[PDB]
């Protein structure tokens, strides 16, 4: 494995199919992750965060294009209306301390260039586990059954539409989770336009306080075009 401690450190993994990012985007507090280069599995070995109500970081693994940095042959960005299947698998190891979540972060925008972000697009999160009383942004607008489980639907109308699906009960793993079901629900709600592009599928841990001991493993994402 390799240890990453730099704020914006990254490593291509799984033959370039995915990329792992330390991503300490909202704080100066220290954080390191130990990464398996073949699998992309990583454990947060250190996290001095104590950021109050604002996220300190989001160590993650992703498929696609994150702020212009794309993985190898992901087939993304690709219009939502041109998607027929989007699947993902992940196994997370939770901890009993700190304030954090274990969640997917999926980015959409009207344009194909993601170098400057996703303004005017959407961010769809899928929260699988958490600790410390953290809550999604915005307000809960519904509770819906999708892809084999039940989810609270949280929405915030920011520079981009924020949609977070929070499982009614925590879990530590998903296998071939139907991401397209979530995208379809968000489109139905008017939060994502079919003409918009899916840029990236990411998962990891949003950290507010602490986080050492959390582990991400068995990541996979596949996308099938129509």
Ligand X SMILES: OC[C@H]1O[C@@H](O[C@H]2[C@H](O)[C@@H](O)[C@H](O[C@H]3[C@H](O)[C@@H](O)[C@H](O)O[C@@H]3CO)O[C@@H]2CO)[C@H](O)[C@@H](O)[C@@H]1O
User: Could you tell me which of 127, 205, 113, 134 has the C-alpha nearest to residue 162?
Assistant: 127
Number of other CB atoms surrounding residue 190 within 10 Å? 9
Q: Is 135 a binder of ligand X (CB under 6 A)?
A: no
- Residue 85, number of CB atoms within 10 A of its CB: 13
Among 38, 195, 206, 209, the active-site one is 206
The upper half-sphere exposure of residue 116, i.e. CA atoms within 13 Å in the direction of its Cβ, equals 5
Q: How many residues make contact with ligand X (CB under 6 A)?
A: 11
Indicate the residue among 85 and 155 with the shorter CB distance to ligand X. 155
Contact call for residue 61 and ligand X (CB under 6 A): no
If binding is defined by CB under 6 A, does position 209 make contact with ligand X?
no
Identify any residues that bridge with 129 across adjacent strands, giving them in sequence order: 102
The residue within the footprint of ligand X, chosen from 105, 108, 121, 131 (CB under 6 A), is 105
Instruction: Select the residue interacting with ligand X from 14, 18, 47, 58 (CB under 6 A).
Output: 58
Residue number with CB closer to ligand X (6 or 194): 6
Choice among 123, 145, 152, 202 that is catalytic: 123
123 binds ligand X (CB under 6 A): yes
Nearer to ligand X, 126 or 223 (CB): 126
| Minimal distance, residue 211 CB to ligand X, in Å | 12
* Residue 25 is a binding residue for ligand X (CB under 6 A): yes
| Omega prior to 77 cis, within 30 of 0 | yes
Asked if 28 and 200 touch (Cβ cutoff 8 Å), the reply is no
Q: Does 123 participate in catalysis according to the annotation?
A: yes
Whole-angstrom distance, CA of residue 14 vs CA of residue 176: 18
DSSP string spanning 205-224? --EEE--TT-EEEEEEEEEE
Of 27, 33, 47, 55, which one interacts with ligand X (CB under 6 A)?
55
Judged by the rule CB under 6 A, the positions of this chain that interact with ligand X are 8, 23, 25, 55, 58, 67, 105, 123, 137, 162, 206
């Amino acid at each position: 494995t390799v240890e990453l401690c730099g704020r914006w450190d990254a490593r291509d993994v799984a033959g370039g199919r995915y990329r792992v990012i330390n991503n300490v985007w909202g704080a100066e507090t220290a954080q390191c992750i130990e990464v398996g280069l073949e699998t992309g599995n990583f454990t947060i070995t250190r996290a001095d965060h104590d950021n109050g109500n604002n996220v300190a970081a989001y160590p993650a693994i992703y498929f696609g294009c994150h702020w212009g940095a794309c993985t190898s042959n992901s087939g993304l960005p690709r219009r939502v209306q041109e998607l027929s299947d989007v699947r993902t698998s992940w196994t997370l190891t939770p901890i009993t301390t700190g304030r954090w979540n274990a969640a997917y972060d999926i980015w959409f925008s009207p344009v194909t260039n993601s170098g400057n972000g996703y303004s005017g697009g959407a961010e769809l999160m899928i929260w699988l586990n958490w600790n410390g009383g953290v809550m999604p942004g915005g307000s809960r607008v519904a509770t819906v059954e999708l892809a084999g489980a039940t989810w609270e639907v949280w929405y915030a109308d920011w520079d981009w539409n924020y949609i977070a699906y929070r499982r009614t009960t925590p879990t530590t793993s998903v296998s071939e989770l139907d991401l397209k079901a979530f995208i379809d629900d968000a489109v139905a709600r008017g939060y994502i336009r079919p003409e918009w592009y899916l840029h990236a599928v990411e998962t990891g841990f949003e950290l507010w306080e602490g986080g050492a001991g959390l582990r991400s493993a068995d990541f996979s994402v596949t996308v099938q075009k129509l």
